[PDB]
Every structure is written in structure tokens, then in C-alpha cells.
């Protein structure tokens, strides 16, 4: 089957330029339309533009006209998307998609709809600098809840686990973009109240982009 593999995540500053690639492994590459669709966090899908690798024909969405360039590359079977003059609202996940085909294998007729998609590339556009997070414990006050607060980090994502992956009652909340330009999330868990003074709870925070690893023990706070 046709498989699309995109480049890794990128972090850019306003005004700069970013280029995302899509390696099209399989089918034929030259005959079928490769389109780019982006998605801002918590928003819908937006079509940006497309290219047939041969020719090479390219259509752009009016909202991106002039600011955007989409390229083929038949030699490597790889599509390219370059967006310049970036701004904070360009922060989104960018997907590359190839249209589907019917009627014999890679010798088939195009349908128009995007039947094949990439895994997507997260592109953050900020004025902030890569920073490791500070992990402060949300100590517990039947069933009692406690957790860890992952505050002030850049950029996304951050991964939190409990007792090194050991899962029930775990709630890791989506990060929010603070006014400080950094991200902050909270991770809670519900555990029996009669286990809190005996049991060890350790939340494992991992921020790959800043190469940071913190394992914070949440124990009963006492006054």
C-alpha cells in the first residue's frame, strides 16, 4: 500500500521560514496529486494547496498565496512544503495527503479525495526558547486524588507517567499556552485514601525537546 512519511517536528520564530517534507513510499508517485492540509490546535482542517509531481502543476489556497511554495522531486519520490513569513497562528500540525486511485494498481484513475495521509508534522511558531519544565507536586488533601503540575516548558509535547508506567485513574490534561509563552499542564490520579500513607507514588516527566527527565515523588504533605 501507499505509505507517506513526514519530517520531524520544527520550532520557528515569527518571520522565519519552514520546510516540511513527505516521503511517498509506494504506488506511482508522478501521476497523482499530493496536497497539504494543516490543522491548528483545537481547530478544523484547512486545505493549503496541491501539486502533481510531473508537469509540475500547483494550486494554492488564496489565504496562503505568495507566502507558500509546494515542490515535487520525482528523483526521490518526496514532496515539499515551504511556508515563509511565519506567525504564531501558523502554529499547527501539517499533514501531507495523496489522492486515492481506483482501477488497477498504480495504473489507475484518480478520485480526487485524499485516501492516503502522512503522520503529520507539528510546527510551532513562537518567540520562546527551549526550556525544561518545573515539576511541582499536587499533594493529596474512600477515594483521594493527587498529582503533578508540569509548569513552564517549551515546546510541546511533554509526557508524564506514574510509577514508571505501572495506569488506572490517570488523567493527563492537555497543555495550555500561558501568557508567558510557555506551556503548562496538570496530571492527576485517583487512588484509595487508605493507601496514601503507605504507598509510594512517583510521576515520571519527560521533555524530549529540552532533553529533560524528572521523576517527582508525590507523598502525603504534612503540617
Amino acid at each position: 500500500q501507499v505509505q507517506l512519511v513526514q519530517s520531524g517536528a520544527e520550532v520557528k520564530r515569527p518571520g522565519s521560514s519552514v520546510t516540511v517534507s513527505c516521503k511517498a513510499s509506494g504506488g506511482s508517485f508522478s501521476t497523482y496529486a499530493l496536497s497539504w492540509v494543516r490543522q491548528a490546535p483545537g481547530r478544523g482542517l484547512e486545505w493549503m494547496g496541491g501539486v502533481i509531481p510531473l508537469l509540475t502543476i500547483t494550486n494554492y489556497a488564496p489565504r496562503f498565496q505568495g507566502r507558500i511554495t509546494i515542490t515535487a522531486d520525482r528523483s526521490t519520490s518526496t514532496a515539499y512544503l515551504e511556508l515563509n513569513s511565519l506567525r504564531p497562528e501558523d502554529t499547527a500540525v501539517y499533514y501531507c495527503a495523496r489522492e486515492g486511485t481506483t482501477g488497477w494498481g498504480w495504473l489507475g484513475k484518480p478520485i480526487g479525495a485524499f485516501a492516503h495521509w502522512g503522520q503529520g508534522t507539528l510546527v510551532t511558531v513562537s518567540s520562546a526558547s527551549t526550556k525544561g519544565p518545573s515539576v511541582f507536586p499536587l499533594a493529596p488533601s474512600g477515594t483521594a486524588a493527587l498529582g503533578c503540575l508540569v509548569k513552564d516548558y517549551f515546546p510541546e509535547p511533554v509526557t508524564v507517567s506514574w510509577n514508571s508506567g505501572a495506569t488506572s485513574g490517570v488523567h493527563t490534561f492537555p497543555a495550555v499556552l500561558q501568557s508567558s509563552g510557555l506551556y503548562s499542564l496538570s496530571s492527576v490520579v485517583t487512588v484509595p485514601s487508605s493507601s496514601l500513607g503507605t504507598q509510594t507514588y512517583i510521576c515520571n516527566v519527560n521533555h524530549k525537546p529540552s532533553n529533560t527527565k524528572v521523576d517527582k515523588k508525590v507523598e502525603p504533605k504534612s503540617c
Binding site: 478544523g44 482542517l45 486545505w47 486515492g100 479525495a113 485524499f114 502522512g118 500561558q178 492527576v188
Partner: protein
């Protein structure tokens, strides 16, 4: 320009129900070039229908599509647990997308378990303070969280986030975080969060005393 509007915004159904999603076009869609896509959180979209009514191989047959001109309908004959996601319709005869329709699991009303967390001392030695109000496992999604500092109403000083609908009990969880400087605290002493929800006959309020 062709504009595509989807309906409803949120559809709440139980596993096994017939689902009908709508897509209205501002103007006539040439050669019925209308497509339906499905997307779950943290995943790429997935084609369900193309050419208004044609279904690709691999897509289950509970998914059907119909309509013409300006009115198109996606029909899921009998909802399965994995069908509960966000659905987008797309024109491709300039290509455009709909603003999306979420299909969530409709379950029994459940009141939120409200908790409140005091600023840790570790965060204090750096000189800022974050109070967190937790609403654990509740349904429906619409919930009001109101902060009170010495019985004084707050605004513009808190940010909240909601989890995706749980795969097991189908409930939501909310976390509202009110954060301020060590100047507005200790300049205040008792912290409290009041929660208003359908599962509550009356607004439930949780509180703690600073340093106590």
C-alpha cells in the same frame, strides 16, 4: 467561493444508534465532488466517503453517504465505539472543509468530583503560586468553574483544560488553574472554587486556608 457547513456541532448518541451527519453547501457542488473524513484525537484524518456516495475498500459498510446539489448526508447505520470521533466534509471539485462535527457518547448524568490543590512549597521558593481546581469524571461536558479569593470574584487570572471523553466510563475531567504572584498572596488567605453543573442540584464549593 464554496462554503461547507456541517450539522450538528455536537451529536450525542449511544453505541448501536443510527447516526446522521449533515453537510450543507453554500452553492452547488459540481459533479458531486463531496468527501467525508473521520478523525480521532492524535491521529490523521481518514477518508470514509468520496464522490458523495462511493466508499473506499477497507472502510466498514455501516458508513454510507448520500445527497446532491447542496445537501449531503453521512449515515452510520449502527454506531460502534471507534466511530465516536470528529467528522469533516470536504469539497474538491479550490478545496474546502467543513467546520467539523463531533460524535460523542451520550451517557448517564454524572456529577463532578471536585478537588482543590494548594501551592507546593517548591513552587513558592521560586516565587509564584498556582491553585488548581479539579473536576473529576463528569458528564455532560458543559461545566462552570468560578474562583473565589476571600469571597471575591476572579476573572482573567485562570486557564482551564478538559480531557477527551474517557474510553471506559465516557466521562470528562476538567482542570482550572488560577495562577498569581506571591504579592496577591499572602495578601489574601482563604482560597475556594465553586462549581456549577447539571449533575449538581446546587453549586458545590471546595476550599482551603493558606498555610493551614
Amino acid at each position: 467561493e464554496i462554503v461547507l457547513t456541517q450539522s450538528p456541532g455536537t451529536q450525542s448518541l449511544s453505541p448501536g444508534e443510527r447516526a446522521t451527519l449533515s453537510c450543507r453547501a453554500s452553492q452547488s457542488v459540481g459533479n458531486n465532488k463531496l468527501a467525508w473524513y473521520q478523525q480521532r484525537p492524535g491521529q490523521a484524518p481518514r477518508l470514509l466517503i468520496y464522490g458523495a456516495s462511493s466508499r473506499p475498500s477497507g472502510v466498514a459498510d455501516r458508513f454510507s453517504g448520500s445527497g446532491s446539489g447542496t445537501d449531503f448526508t453521512l449515515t452510520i447505520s449502527r454506531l460502534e465505539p471507534e466511530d465516536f470521533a470528529v467528522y469533516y466534509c470536504q469539497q474538491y471539485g479550490l478545496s474546502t472543509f467543513g467546520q467539523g462535527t463531533k460524535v460523542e457518547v451520550k451517557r448517564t448524568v454524572a456529577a463532578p468530583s471536585v478537588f482543590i490543590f494548594p501551592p507546593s512549597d517548591e513552587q513558592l521558593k521560586s516565587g509564584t503560586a498556582s491553585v488548581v481546581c479539579l473536576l473529576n469524571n463528569f458528564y455532560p461536558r458543559e461545566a462552570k468553574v468560578q474562583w473565589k479569593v476571600d469571597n471575591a470574584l476572579q476573572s482573567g487570572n485562570s486557564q482551564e483544560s478538559v480531557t477527551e471523553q474517557d474510553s471506559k466510563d465516557s466521562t470528562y475531567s476538567l482542570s482550572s488553574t488560577l495562577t498569581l504572584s506571591k504579592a496577591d498572596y499572602e495578601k489574601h488567605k482563604v482560597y475556594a472554587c465553586e462549581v456549577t453543573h447539571q449533575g449538581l442540584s446546587s453549586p458545590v464549593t471546595k476550599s482551603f486556608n493558606r498555610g493551614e
